[PDB]
Amino acid sequence: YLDLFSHKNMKLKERVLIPVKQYPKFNFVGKILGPQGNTIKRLQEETGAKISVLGKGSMRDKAKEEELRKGGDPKYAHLNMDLHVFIEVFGPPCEAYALMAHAMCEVKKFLVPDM
Amino acid sequence: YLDLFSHKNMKLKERVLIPVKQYPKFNFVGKILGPQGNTIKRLQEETGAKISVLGKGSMRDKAKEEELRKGGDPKYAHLNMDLHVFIEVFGPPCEAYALMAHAMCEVKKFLVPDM
Numbered sequence: 060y061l062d063l064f065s066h067k068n069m070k071l072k073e074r075v076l077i078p079v080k081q082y083p084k085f086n087f088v089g090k091i092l093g094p095q096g097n098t099i100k101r102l103q104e105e106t107g108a109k110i111s112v113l114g115k116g117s118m119r120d121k122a123k124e125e126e127l128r129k130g131g132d133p134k135y136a137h138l139n140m141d142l143h144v145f146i147e148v149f150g151p152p153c154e155a156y157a158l159m160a161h162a163m164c165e166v167k168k169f170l171v172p173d174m
Numbered sequence: 175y176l177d178l179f180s181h182k183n184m185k186l187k188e189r190v191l192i193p194v195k196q197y198p199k200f201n202f203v204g205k206i207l208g209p210q211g212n213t214i215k216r217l218q219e220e221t222g223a224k225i226s227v228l229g230k231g232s233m234r235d236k237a238k239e240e241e242l243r244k245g246g247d248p249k250y251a252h253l254n255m256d257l258h259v260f261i262e263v264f265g266p267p268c269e270a271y272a273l274m275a276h277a278m279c280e281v282k283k284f285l286v287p288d289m
């Protein structure tokens with residue numbers, strides 16, 4: 060059950076696949092991060108969600124990625140996953156759902172770019 | 175992972191406790207259903223969610239409830255639960271989250287009535 064008077068926040072998290080198969084040559088990583096990561100910065104500010112691009116190719120740098128994978132450091136474990144966008148929100152339920160709805164809708168625009 | 179090109183819908187479901195302890199004398203069932211259940215009818219149409227009031231007291235009729243519990247029919251199993259509102263939405267992710275956000279926000283107005 061959700062309890063609207065609880066002192067815990069809700070967390071919502073989603074990992075949305077970047078559709079590399081549907082759009083094999085589209086540079087989603089470049090488009091989502093934007094120059095110096097300003098697009099994703101703005102995306103987070105406008106939606107109030109934490110949003111990261113994770114998985115292989117998320118760093119646009121085959122060689123850097125390979126080197127951070129091979130170090131074995133668990134913070135880079137995500138570099139073996141499928142490329143995806145990771146959205147995380149927290150709050151009381153009404154706010155969490157609303158933030159996730161907003162984030163999910165904005166992210167969907169980037170991931171279905173010919174819509 | 176969510177796959178935006180999958181043919182499956184997402185389902186989201188929440189059971190939100192009606193806060194009988196915070197408001198021990200407020201008739202939430204009457205207020206939510208409305209005369210002939212028109213309020214909840216309209217609530218569903220406006221939000222696009224399925225919304226039901228379930229659990230003990232959901233029928234405003236101690237004796238009817240007791241009689242349907244005692245028959246043992248599984249469709250009335252919910253009459254032993256804590257009184258709550260049950261929200262269910264389905265769709266592709268952007269739509270599901272947005273419908274749930276809307277439903278959850280409207281329902282919260284009814285359940286925190288002195289806000």
Ligand SMILES: [Li+]
Pocket residue numbers: 173
């Ligand atoms: Li297309």
Ligand SMILES: [Li+]
Pocket residue numbers: 288
């Ligand atoms: Li109060």
